[PDB]
Write a protein that binds this DNA or RNA. Structure first.
Ligand code: IHP
Ligand code: IHP
Ligand code: ZN
Ligand code: ZN
Lengths: 397, 394
RNA sequence: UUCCCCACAUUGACGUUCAGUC
RNA sequence: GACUGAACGACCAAUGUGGGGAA
């Protein structure tokens, strides 16, 4: 099956694709096991499993499971947080990325902690200013099934024939932006009659829109996985690899993960359209039809236990904010910002100490973001949907 | 468990008609299976459609015959429409009926000497209509899943064991077949809409029950959207059950539960067909229920056997009943029909969903129906993800 | 009549074993 | 391998009946 064969990376090829895929799938699944009393725990129940793994060199056993997560559902509109205490998106892979961020903050704290630790940190000072990764370190993303949104919209028991080389005899656009529908694991296209969300309107019962994971990952393949805030310290980090435990299709997946916005232009220095290794695994999971657990589990290496969050409310069953919510990450960030000398910043601590404004200090990441949004529009693939601005207006302590 | 008569001038004898169409359908299934000895003669449920052309109960023709009890698996849904999503017998029988209707249109438009033989004729209102004596009667070897069958799935012991609890909330409720589970469940508990990737990920594919679907045929007609562009709404005159008949449940399910429907467009109405069990009720069919579903339309040489799990035949080939096939038929007739003869002349692109939307009135009827159910507190209709009907003919 | 709680039944997938057909 | 069939085990989320309550 030409549809069921690995797509090599436009990054660094340090391992062979299939050994790497089977490796990270095996490790992540194993580490979730260890975190759950050998899959016996109540919180081992899941529909989609994801994780992030790190490699330091060509030795494919140099690997570390960085983070592990499960989840297939999104916050209710009615339940959003004004102080950023809620998790808007608890799909497995989104959560994994967020935990990965915690690992990145810990690694900066490690470097800046003392000098003897700097040899142990994944980071180093960067010649261009700020920090950069060590010369060989790569991260790999694993999802137990293809990401929601465009990567999954296809008939897995029918041969592919999407777009012939000649201009489609009918019409174009087979990459459209799609959103999670509130109260569902599913995804629907974006309206071309695009109205924006408001804060008190959505809170009343109007549709909560969250971009699909396919669209989110593409975003990660343009602006990097660190997000805005961290980019003030560090240079853009991209996934080198994307491994799927099931529903793998090279044509569709390469389309969704980068190929559909290949018309992107004017990306700032260090930014690029990252085309990672794509691959499924040798022994793919079977579809289990049945109820998807209402919770989302997350773990970052260093942690003792996993954390269990009610996807609907974005907080845990006792209503306590997660270590992953905006407020928490801002906390980690503020701490790092304090431990970091001002001549070592990638941009300037100019703006106020509210979340959104501190995001705007990342001028370049912001610029990349705009090129991205524009890329989707000109590609005839729909306009991105952002949360209402009130979501990001809060302070700490 | 006694037949419920139809309209305001009675054209056939009830029990004679029931016994007639049951005998006929079951018999033609016989001829088609070399007297029930055939490999694919095994069945759990049988359905068929019979046409009558006049009162002479030997003027009857068996139009379609079918068997099947299962719905497609999630992984096997087709984005090109090559799959049969629902293979419960009576659903398939309706689809076979459609093939017959398309064929009749083709026959009418073929030439002038043939128009006399087609069941259709021009309508004063534009498009086509059935000739004045033509009726279709639906036969199922058992009560349709959903509202007619969920309560009292067993032979009535007669004595008129009428429902001891007719006013529960559960009565008349819309219900859906759930993938990987038994029974048929309210939609009120399934509040969100279906998605393609959600189903593919493992969320259970929901298919509307047969009871609800037939009620639907009793409002928007059995020809469906696409054919309604050519012809005026056609209804089943009779619904005959080879077993498990309970008049109260069947009548509630087939129409009475939506008698609150309003603003139906012209020619559309709440059809109340003849309901009846038969003289000699069928025996339960012994065995594991077969994974295949059989269909035959009058005219055909052979029957077709479709894998209910996959929606395609034993070799992975598309059925003559799938969306794609029917669209093909519709497109051919569409070209052969002069535009002054269409019931709707709104022009739309040649993708399936879009071509369905050209049936503006039918579409409207559909809306009155969904609302009827909703305001009656009987739940919201559940549709396939919107992706299912976005395909063209290559 | 309708609901509630408990108990017992009823009605498409899965696994095991056994027999077959291409 | 696919399909076909007969047993046995474990599900599925509705539904029935009963006893007991309640409006
Ligand atoms: O990982 P996610 O759950 O998708 O969170 C992201 C993330 O928000 P936080 O990092 O503040 O949690 C984005 O922030 P960046 O790091 O990319 O800046 C933000 O984008 P903006 O901050 O540019 O607005 C986007 O929110 P949205 O695109 O809806 O405004 C939001 O996604 P969710 O809102 O789906 O969480
Ligand atoms: O006999 P069925 O198997 O139930 O097929 C019908 C039929 O679809 P096709 O004729 O295209 O196969 C309906 O179309 P109409 O002819 O009634 O318009 C369609 O309804 P919509 O056109 O309103 O979408 C409905 O699908 P659904 O109602 O679930 O969207 C679908 O039934 P299944 O989807 O269960 O096959
Ligand atoms: Zn997702
Ligand atoms: Zn049925």
């Amino acid at each position: 099956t030409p549809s069921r064969q690995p797509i090599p990376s436009e990054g660094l090829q340090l391992h062979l694709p299939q050994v790497l895929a089977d490796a990270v799938s095996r490790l992540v699944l194993g580490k979730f096991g260890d975190l759950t009393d050998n899959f016996s725990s109540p919180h081992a129940r899941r529909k989609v499993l994801a994780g992030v793994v790190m490699t330091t060199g060509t030795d494919v056993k140099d690997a570390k499971v960085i983070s592990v997560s499960t989840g297939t559902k999104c916050i209710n509109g009615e339940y959003m947080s004004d102080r950023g205490l809620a998790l808007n998106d608890c799909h497995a892979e989104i959560i994994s990325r967020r935990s990965l961020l915690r690992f990145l903050y810990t690694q900066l704290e490690l470097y800046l902690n003392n000098k003897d630790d700097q040899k142990r940190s994944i980071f180093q000072k960067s010649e261009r200013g700020g920090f950069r990764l060590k010369e060989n370190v790569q991260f790999h993303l694993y999802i137990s099934t293809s990401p929601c949104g465009d990567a999954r919209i296809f008939s897995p028991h029918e041969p592919i024939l999407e777009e012939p080389a000649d201009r489609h005899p009918n019409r174009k656009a087979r990459g459209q932006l799609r959103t999670k529908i509130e109260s569902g694991e599913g995804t629907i296209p974006v309206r071309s009659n695009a109205s924006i969300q408001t804060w008190d309107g959505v809170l009343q019962g109007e549709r909560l829109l969250t971009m699909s994971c396919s669209d989110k990952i593409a975003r990660w393949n343009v602006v990097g996985i660190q997000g805005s805030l961290l980019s003030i310290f560090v240079e853009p980090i991209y996934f080198s690899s994307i491994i799927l435990g099931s529903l793998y299709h090279g044509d569709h997946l390469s389309r969704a993960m980068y190929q559909r916005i290949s018309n992107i232009e004017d990306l700032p220095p260090l930014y690029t359209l990252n085309k990672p290794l794509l691959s499924g695994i040798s022994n793919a999971e079977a579809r289990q039809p049945g109820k998807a657990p209402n919770f989302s589990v997350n773990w970052t290496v260093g942690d003792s236990a996993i954390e269990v969050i009610n996807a609907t409310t974005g907080k845990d069953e006792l209503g306590r904010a997660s270590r992953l919510c905006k407020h928490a990450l801002y906390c980690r960030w503020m701490r790092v910002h304090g431990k970091v000398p001002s001549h070592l910043l990638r941009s300037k601590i100019t703006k106020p100490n509210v979340y959104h404004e501190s995001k705007l200090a990342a001028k370049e990441y912001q610029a990349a973001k705009a090129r991205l949004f524009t890329a989707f529009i000109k590609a005839g693939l729909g306009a991105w949907v952002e949360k209402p601005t009130e979501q990001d207006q809060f302070s700490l302590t």
